[PDB]
């Protein structure tokens, strides 16, 4: 409902800014923007409310502002322990009485950025014989651990049947993910190719597979 | 004869946090006339039998009056808990008197809400009996001072009833009169 | 200090019922609005319901209208979310929070402030089921071949290669949860680029399934 970046990264000591765009009937209509921090497996914690106000000294390195339908959260003096998910939200005065963005993962860079290595497997012929078809896109060794994966049949976007994992930290501290596209055998044989496109840090990697 | 109409037939009633009081003395109180005068939906007494009221003498009687939801008239009584009894209008445990109420939807509701009638929602402690708290100081729920403004752990202490004529019966406005029967001193208010 | 102790939740089948509760202490419960928020796995927060300090008002997200009921017992300092007709899309961690509310008199909204610890609600029709294992054949000086371990329940699965002899270049990825309610994962080995035979051993104890699959070009 609100729009925020999937992920932002900064180096320790720097400031980073997370934008959060809404509409005239929420971010642009009230001064009721709130920002929450959430660590894995923990409940959200209110860091900023009324666009720019701090509940406590725990938000001393946080600041907020708003222009038009976009709010911004800035974290200064970035520390390793700032790695967390940040959620913007706004009152709407109607269902949903509170709207959220999708959450932003902040990465505090601890190693050089690294592009995902992508491998794409086509459906097994044994799978085809079982009246099944799965495309398997394996994504490994990327840092920061944030990736968006798009599927294409020929060159058209494919949305149904897609199941992609959240990234998981490898033992080398880089990240891995995988995405699956399930198809009928006929769907698989009736296209010329399928593609797994993985976008990472504004750069996209693509693998394509074809029936043979 | 006690001028009860000055209280019961008042054109406008107070909000319950700002409840009004009229001292009544030096007059004959006829409660069978009061009871049959109107369509009261609540007429209950404490420390006295409602049906033996016209043979009683007291020093003074105080008539407190305010508006609340019909579902809150039950809180206007000794020994009750709830935001109304705790923060707005509190009767002592040994209250002697009567509580009278009637539906006022036709007078006190307004299309699109009548927001004039208020109640207190936050308070640092419960009212003592017959205490009256009109403060609008921002309520400080946490350790941070509120600086007179709303915010985190900082609440404006009053809330509006939104009395609309389409409200359910529990949520319609009811005018309430609490007659307190005081006896210290020669008696100045007797039944007939 | 404020405490919100969440209770309830667990695993049900579609169409089942649950009741969540939140028990408050450290603040005067009946002065505050309460709010429920949910978070599906890997997703953001979603507002679910809210209720006024006096239950005189309660709001619900559209997709739970007529299925969820928010309520509160002020004498017990508790707020409740009654859930009926549960659907798989209702699977989430559910949080109770304080505030979330709106004062008509001042037009001021207090943001959800203190939050319960969360409780997991899982709505699933899946039943124990052993995986089907399919070889993922090969075709930077190295070749990737693997095993698709598909359509099993519940977790976990164990995968090794050559009965544990091959451990280098082996990356077993964490599972997806499909919309059928079943899991799939993949185990891939990167090997030097017709000579060595590569075999993956898949073990699913809940179904007492064991399967070895040879992966060849
Ligand atoms: C209010 O007016 C009506 C009509 O004249 C009368 O019957 C009633 O007694 C009055 N109220 C009181 C408390 O006397």
Q: Write the DSSP assignment of B71-125 as a string of letters.
A: GGGGGSSTT--SHHHHHT----TT--EEEEEEE-HHHH--TT-B---EEE---SS
- Give the pair of three-digit tokens for residue C153: 């329940």
For A51, phi then psi, to 5°, come to 70, -45
For chain B, the helix, strand and coil percentages under 3-state DSSP, each to the nearest 5: 20, 30, 50
Q: Is B149 touching A (CB cutoff 8 A)?
A: no
Choose the final residue of a domain: C62, C93, C123. C123
Order of all β-strands in the sheet with C45-51: C10-12, C119-123, C92-98, C34-39, C45-51, C58-60
Q: How far apart are alpha carbons A52 and A32 in whole angstroms?
A: 9
**Substitution candidate for ligand 1 out of B1, B3, B9 with most atoms within 8 A of CB:** B9
The total domain count for chain B is: 2
- Are C65 and C104 within one domain? yes
- Contacts (Cβ under 8 Å, ≥6 apart) of A148: A6, A198, A199, A200
Give domain status of residue B175, yes or no: yes
Q: How far is A14 from chain B (nearest CA, A)?
A: 28
- Are A94 and A145 within one domain? no
The answer for C 36-95 residues in CB contact with B (under 8 A) is 53-54, 56, 75
In this structure, the residue with its CA closest to atom 5 of ligand 1 is: B37
Residue A135: half-sphere exposure toward Cβ, Cα within 13 Å: 32
In this structure, the residue with its CA closest to atom 9 of ligand 1 is: B37
Give domain status of residue A86, yes or no: yes
Residue B120's domain comprises 113-164
C-chain residue closest to B124, CA distance: C28
Give domain status of residue A88, yes or no: yes
B-chain residue closest to A51, CA distance: B151
Which of A34, A49, A56 should be substituted to probe chain B, the one whose Cβ sees the most B Cβ atoms within 10 Å?
Answer: A56
- Are C104 and C25 within one domain? yes
B-chain residue closest to C101, CA distance: B155
- For chain B, first and last CA: distance in Å? 9
- Are C54 and C117 within one domain? yes
B-chain residue closest to C98, CA distance: B153
- Are B68 and B88 within one domain? yes
Alpha helices in chain A (DSSP H): 125-129, 185-190
Rg (CA), chain C: 24
- Give the pair of three-digit tokens for residue B36: 């049959």
Task: Tell me the CATH number at A186.
Answer: 2.60.40.10
Residue A144's domain comprises 117-209
- Are B106 and B145 within one domain? no
Choose the final residue of a domain: A69, A90, A108. A108
Give domain status of residue B97, yes or no: yes
Residue C180's domain comprises 132-215
Q: Would you call C103 and B159 a contact, using CB atoms and an 8 Å cutoff?
A: yes
E strand or H helix at C189: strand C183-192
Q: Is B151 touching A (CB cutoff 8 A)?
A: yes
Q: Is C1 touching B (CB cutoff 8 A)?
A: no
- Are B47 and B141 within one domain? no
DSSP state of B15: B
Burial class of residue A157 (count of CB atoms within 10 Å of its CB; 0-12, 13-18, 19+): exposed
The count of residues in chain A is 212
Q: Would you call A50 and B151 a contact, using CB atoms and an 8 Å cutoff?
A: yes
Nearest to C113 among B83, B115, B152 (CB): B152
Task: Tell me the sheet residues that pair with A195.
Answer: A152, A208
Give domain status of residue B86, yes or no: yes
- Are C12 and C74 within one domain? yes
Q: How far apart are alpha carbons A121 and A180 in whole angstroms?
A: 10
Choose the final residue of a domain: A41, A74, A108. A108
Ligand 1 pocket check for B54: Cβ under 6 Å: no
Residue C83: which of C5, C15, C7, C6 has the closest Cα?
C15
Choose the final residue of a domain: A108, A128, A147. A108
- Are C112 and C192 within one domain? no
**How many C-beta neighbours within 10 Å does residue B112 have?**
7
- Are B2 and B59 within one domain? yes
In contact, B123 and B140? CB cutoff 8 Å: no
- Are B87 and B177 within one domain? yes
- Are B154 and B103 within one domain? no
- Are A27 and A93 within one domain? yes
Give domain status of residue B128, yes or no: yes
Experimental method: X-ray
- Are B73 and B160 within one domain? no
Q: Would you call A101 and C44 a contact, using CB atoms and an 8 Å cutoff?
A: yes
Ligand 1 pocket check for B4: Cβ under 6 Å: yes
Q: Is A49 touching C (CB cutoff 8 A)?
A: yes
Q: Parallel, antiparallel, or unpaired: how do β-strands B57-58 and A203-209 relate?
A: unpaired
Choose the final residue of a domain: C67, C96, C123. C123
In contact, A34 and C111? CB cutoff 8 Å: yes
E strand or H helix at C161: strand C158-161
DSSP state of A145: S
- Are A72 and A128 within one domain? no
In this structure, the residue with its CA closest to atom 12 of ligand 1 is: B5
- Are A133 and A104 within one domain? no
A-chain residue closest to C108, CA distance: A32
Give domain status of residue A172, yes or no: yes
- Are A98 and A123 within one domain? no
Q: How far apart are alpha carbons A206 and A178 in whole angstroms?
A: 14
Q: How far is A46 from chain B (nearest CA, A)?
A: 10
- Are A76 and A133 within one domain? no
Q: How far apart are alpha carbons C46 and A103 in whole angstroms?
A: 11
- Are B173 and B88 within one domain? yes
Place of tokens 């059928």: C180
The answer for C 103-132 residues in CB contact with A (under 8 A) is 109, 111-113, 115-118, 132
Give domain status of residue B189, yes or no: no
Place of tokens 């055998």: A185
Q: Which residues of C touch B155 (CB under 8 A)?
A: 31, 103, 110
**How many C-beta neighbours within 10 Å does residue A192 have?**
10
Residue C71: half-sphere exposure toward Cβ, Cα within 13 Å: 8
Resolution in A: 2.2
Task: Tell me the CATH number at C177.
Answer: 2.60.40.10
DSSP annotation string for C110-121: ----SB---EEE
- Are A157 and A180 within one domain? yes
In contact, A89 and A34? CB cutoff 8 Å: yes
- Are C32 and C119 within one domain? yes
Nearest to C105 among B81, B152, B158 (CB): B158
- For chain A, first and last CA: distance in Å? 42
- Are C40 and C95 within one domain? yes
Nearest to A126 among C62, C116, C135 (CB): C135
- Are C59 and C89 within one domain? yes
Q: Is A53 touching B (CB cutoff 8 A)?
A: yes
Q: Would you call C56 and B156 a contact, using CB atoms and an 8 Å cutoff?
A: no
Give domain status of residue B191, yes or no: no
Give domain status of residue B139, yes or no: yes
- Are B92 and B140 within one domain? no
- Are C83 and C37 within one domain? yes
- Say how many Å lie between the CA of residue B182 and the centre of ligand 1: 24
CA dihedral C55, C61, C63, C64 (to 10 degrees): -20
- Are A94 and A140 within one domain? no
The total domain count for chain A is: 2
- Are B98 and B30 within one domain? yes
Give domain status of residue A2, yes or no: no
Choose the final residue of a domain: C85, C100, C123. C123
For CA atoms B53, B54, B59, B61, give the dihedral sign: positive
Q: Which residues of B touch A55 (CB under 8 A)?
A: 144, 152-153
Task: Tell me the sheet residues that pair with A64.
Answer: A73
Give domain status of residue A64, yes or no: yes
For CA atoms B128, B129, B132, B136, give the dihedral sign: positive
Q: Is C113 touching B (CB cutoff 8 A)?
A: yes
- Are A75 and A155 within one domain? no
Q: How far apart are alpha carbons A63 and B145 in whole angstroms?
A: 20
- Are A92 and A134 within one domain? no
Give domain status of residue A1, yes or no: no
- Are C80 and C172 within one domain? no
- Are C204 and C152 within one domain? yes
Q: How far apart are alpha carbons C196 and C189 in whole angstroms?
A: 13
Nearest to C62 among A45, A95, A138 (CB): A95
Burial class of residue C88 (count of CB atoms within 10 Å of its CB; 0-12, 13-18, 19+): middle
The total domain count for chain C is: 2
- Are C8 and C84 within one domain? yes
Give domain status of residue B190, yes or no: no
């Amino acid at each position: 409902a609100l729009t925020q970046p999937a992920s932002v990264s900064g180096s320790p000591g720097q400031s980073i800014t997370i934008s959060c765009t809404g509409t005239s009937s929420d971010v642009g209509g009230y001064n009721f923007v709130s920002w929450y921090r959430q660590y894995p497996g923990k409940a959200p914690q209110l860091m900023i409310y009324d666009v720019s106000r701090r509940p406590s000294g725990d938000s001393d390195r946080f600041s907020g502002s708003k222009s038009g339908n976009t709010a911004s959260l800035t974290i200064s003096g970035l520390q390793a322990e700032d790695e967390a998910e940040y959620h913007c939200s706004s009152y709407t005065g109607r269902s949903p009485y509170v709207v959220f963005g999708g959450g932003t993962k902040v990465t505090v860079l601890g190693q050089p950025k690294a592009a995902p290595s992508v491998t794409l497997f086509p459906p097994s012929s044994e799978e085809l014989q079982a009246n099944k078809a799965t495309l398997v896109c394996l994504i490994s060794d990327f840092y920061p651990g944030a990736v968006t994966v798009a599927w294409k049949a020929d060159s058209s976007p494919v949305k149904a049947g897609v199941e992609t994992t959240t990234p998981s930290k490898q033992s080398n501290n880089k990240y891995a993910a995988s995405s699956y596209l399930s198809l009928t055998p006929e769907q698989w044989k009736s296209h010329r190719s399928y593609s797994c496109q993985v976008t990472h840090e504004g750069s996209t990697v693509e693998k394509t597979v074809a029936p043979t | 004869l006690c001028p009860f109409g000055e209280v019961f037939n008042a054109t406008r009633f107070a909000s319950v946090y700002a409840w009004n009081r009229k001292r009544i003395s030096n007059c004959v109180a006829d409660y069978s006339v009061l009871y049959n005068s109107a369509s009261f939906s609540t007429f209950k007494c404490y420390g006295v039998s409602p049906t033996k009221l016209n043979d009683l003498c007291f020093t003074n009687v105080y008539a407190d009056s305010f508006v609340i939801r019909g579902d809150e008239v039950r809180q206007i009584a000794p020994g009750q808990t709830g935001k109304i009894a705790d923060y707005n209008y509190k009767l002592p445990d040994d209250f002697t008197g009567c509580v009278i109420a009637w539906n006022s939807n036709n007078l006190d509701s307004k299309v699109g809400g009548n927001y004039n009638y208020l109640y207190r929602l936050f308070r640092k402690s419960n009212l003592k009996p017959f205490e009256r708290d009109i403060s609008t100081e921002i309520y400080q729920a946490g350790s941070t001072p509120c600086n007179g403004v709303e915010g985190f752990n900082c609440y404006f202490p009053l809330q509006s009833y939104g009395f609309q004529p389409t409200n359910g019966v529990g949520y319609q406005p009811y005018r309430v009169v609490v007659l307190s029967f005081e006896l210290l001193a020669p008696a100045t208010v007797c039944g007939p | 200090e404020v405490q919100l102790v969440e209770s309830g939740g667990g695993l049900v089948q579609p169409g089942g019922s649950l009741r969540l509760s939140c028990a408050a202490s450290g603040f005067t419960f009946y002065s505050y609005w309460m709010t429920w928020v949910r978070q599906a796995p890997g997703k953001g927060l979603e507002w679910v319901a809210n209720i006024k300090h006096d239950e005189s008002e309660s709001h619900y997200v559209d997709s739970v209208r007529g299925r969820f009921t928010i309520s509160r017992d002020n004498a017990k300092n508790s707020v409740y979310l009654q859930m009926k007709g549960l659907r798989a899309e209702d699977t989430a961690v559910y949080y109770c929070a304080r505030d979330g509310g709106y004062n008509i008199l001042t037009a001021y909204y207090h943001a959800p402030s203190y939050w319960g610890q969360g409780t997991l609600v899982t709505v699933s029709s899946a039943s124990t089921k052993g995986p089907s294992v399919f070889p993922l054949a090969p075709s930077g000086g190295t070749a990737a071949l693997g095993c698709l371990v598909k359509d099993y329940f519940p977790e976990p699965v164990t995968v090794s290669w050559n009965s544990g002899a091959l451990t280098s270049g082996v990356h077993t990825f964490p599972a997806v949860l499909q919309s059928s309610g079943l899991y799939s994962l993949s185990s891939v080995v990167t090997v030097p680029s017709g000579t060595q035979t590569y075999i993956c051993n898949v073990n699913h104890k809940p179904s007492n399934t064991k399967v070895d699959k040879r992966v060849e070009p």
